[PDB]
Amino acid sequence: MNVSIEEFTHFDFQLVPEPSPLDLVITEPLKNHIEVNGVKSGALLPLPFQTGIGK
C-alpha cells in the first residue's frame, strides 16, 4: 500500500514533547545563527557529551 501526505491533512504541529537540558543547548545557538549571517550559512558545532546520559 502507498500512503499519502493527505493523511496528515489535519495534524497537530505546534505541540512537542517536554524539553530536556540537552535540547535547548542545541536549539538556541542555531536560532542565534539564523538572525545574523543567516538564511544561507553553515555552522560547525562540536557538542561535548558523555556516555551514559542519552546522547
Binding site: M1, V3, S4, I5, E7, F8, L15, P17
Partner: protein
C-alpha cells in the same frame, strides 16, 4: 513506534508507515546483491532483455 505524549500514542498506524518508508540504508555492493532474491533479479533481467546476452 513506541513514543507516547500525555499517555496517548503519538502516531497512528498509517502515519508510522509513511514516516518509516522515507529512510534508506546503503551497504556495500557485495552485500547489496546477496541480500536480493531470485525473483527480483529474474524480473529485472527479463524486463531489460539481458538474459539473451552471453
Amino acid at each position: 513506534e513506541k513514543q507516547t505524549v500525555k499517555g496517548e500514542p503519538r502516531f497512528t498506524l498509517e502515519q508510522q508507515e509513511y514516516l518509516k518508508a522515507q529512510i534508506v540504508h546503503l551497504p556495500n555492493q557485495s552485500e547489496q546483491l546477496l541480500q536480493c532474491s531470485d525473483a527480483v533479479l529474474n524480473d529485472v533481467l527479463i524486463g531489460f532483455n539481458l538474459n539473451a546476452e552471453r
